[PDB]
Amino acid sequence: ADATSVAVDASISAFPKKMGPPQWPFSTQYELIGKGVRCVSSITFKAYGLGIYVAAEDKHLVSEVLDSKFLSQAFIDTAAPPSPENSHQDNLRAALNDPAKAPILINNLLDSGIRLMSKNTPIKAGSFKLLMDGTKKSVLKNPDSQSQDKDRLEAGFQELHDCFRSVKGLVARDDDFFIELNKDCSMNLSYYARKKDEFVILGTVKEPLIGKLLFAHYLAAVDPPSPEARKEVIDALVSLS
Ligand SMILES: O=C(O)CCC(=O)C(=O)O
């Protein structure tokens, strides 16, 4: 690793701190805000390296979306108020780690137009393919999914499934599966076959509910795919607010 990349696991490449066009086939320039290893059961069994990125041009939105006004209004009737001597950053941090407040804060963040990107780098290819198959079931444990249009959810997961069909044939260690969350919550999916030094553009998931559900899962305070990646993301967001 260089000062321009960070180590996630010795079995796979260091993650760039910044990624954008033209070097990478992305919509805008992204900055790494959290990383970690997605394990299955134990740290003994590493499935993939996870990197969460924010659009450089959108970092300003965090403080405007997750401001003290929204914190106060969201929970003014539900929870005791935050202590007035605390900083806003301290108050926001406590809410983002509170199981009862975090989903609401994250949903509001994910509706604000902020562009995010996940870098999903396989460590064990077989496990990764299985985690792909299980993605719909996983993100739908989210209770907020039930209120939504079932037909739109099903159609959106077919879009994702089709993109995943193309990924699964390629999966190998140290390849990069990229998922960009556009400002309208549709998703551009791409794939870097590292050994060929080739980019594959997989397509777009138009249904915005799918990107909302997937990135709410990445950033979930309870049972996120990578607890260590989520913690880093939250610290990045608090420090921006
Ligand atoms: O295909 C992916 O990387 C998403 C799956 C996921 O969120 C996980 O189970 O870790």
Author numbering: 70 to 310
Question: What do the study's own words say?
Answer:
Alignments of the Aim18-Nd70-R123A and Aim46-Nd62-WT structures with the bacterial protein revealed that, while the α-helices differed substantially, the core CHI antiparallel β-sheet was structurally homologous to the core antiparallel β-sheet of cytochrome c'β-Met. Upon treatment with sodium carbonate, Aim18p was liberated into the soluble fraction, while a significant proportion of Aim46p remained in the insoluble fraction, suggesting that Aim46p′s transmembrane domain might be more strongly associated with the IMM.
We further show that diverse fungal homologs also bind heme and that Aim18p and Aim46p possess structural homology to a bacterial hemoprotein.
